[PDB]
Amino acid sequence: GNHHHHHMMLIKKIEELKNSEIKDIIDKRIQEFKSFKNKSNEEWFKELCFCILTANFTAEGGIRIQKEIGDGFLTLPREELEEKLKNLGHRFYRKRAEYIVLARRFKNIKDIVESFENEKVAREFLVRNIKGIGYKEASHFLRNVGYDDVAIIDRHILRELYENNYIDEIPKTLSRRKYLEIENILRDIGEEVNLKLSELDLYIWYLRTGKVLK
Numbered sequence: 001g002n003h004h005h006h007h008m009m010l011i012k013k014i015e016e017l018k019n020s021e022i023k024d025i026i027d028k029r030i031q032e033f034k035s036f037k038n039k040s041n042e043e044w045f046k047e048l049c050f051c052i053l054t055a056n057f058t059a060e061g062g063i064r065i066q067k068e069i070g071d072g073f074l075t076l077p078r079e080e081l082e083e084k085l086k087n088l089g090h091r092f093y094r095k096r097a098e099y100i101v102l103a104r105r106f107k108n109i110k111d112i113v114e115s116f117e118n119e120k121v122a123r124e125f126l127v128r129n130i131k132g133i134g135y136k137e138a139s140h141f142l143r144n145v146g147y148d149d150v151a152i153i154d155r156h157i158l159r160e161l162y163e164n165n166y167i168d169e170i171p172k173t174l175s176r177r178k179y180l181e182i183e184n185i186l187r188d189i190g191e192e193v194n195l196k197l198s199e200l201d202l203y204i205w206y207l208r209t210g211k212v213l214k
Helices: 005-018 022-038 041-054 059-069 078-087 093-106 109-115 119-129 135-144 155-163 176-192 197-209
Strands: none
Touching (some): 005 022, 022 135, 041 059, 041 093, 059 078, 093 109, 109 119, 119 135, 135 176, 135 197, 155 176, 155 197, 176 197
16 A cells, blocks of 8 residues: 555644644643743743653652742752642652752753753753753653653654554654754654644644643
């Protein structure tokens, strides 16, 4: 048959979503990310912590841990933070509590991130200096605070890409080189549907779950 039928239908489905009320819902979420340009360093640091907590967890869970703790990401001592995370349901409370505390030396994360030439270079800094932050987490963070040209390459999109033959094998470990390589394929798909990577990510998640989170 036509080996490109599934790719062609994915493009068609996304164009269908863009012509539905789903577009307004996703656009609103995108606008909320963009609003971070006006939020404080403290607000940005909380989002960085949300992303540090995402791995092996739920966005919905992260959102509630955020609302629960809030200012505590900056004021709570190691021991007290580790305690709240354990009681809030996070299985890696110990490691995450440590990463968060260590990240505090960069608490003015908004000023640091905006000082860079662009988001790509800023991502490099996030990955290299902040423990608990890999390329996926850094991209997730940048997207959530308003940047549009970084892909969030999670284990689900990797499986979809592999299964539909966009990549030869599920990577497991993503080196900088491999991350940027896979990000470019997603970037091409995005342009094929006239969507930025920040937006494409939400359309893809919506197709997978019917929900629009962050």
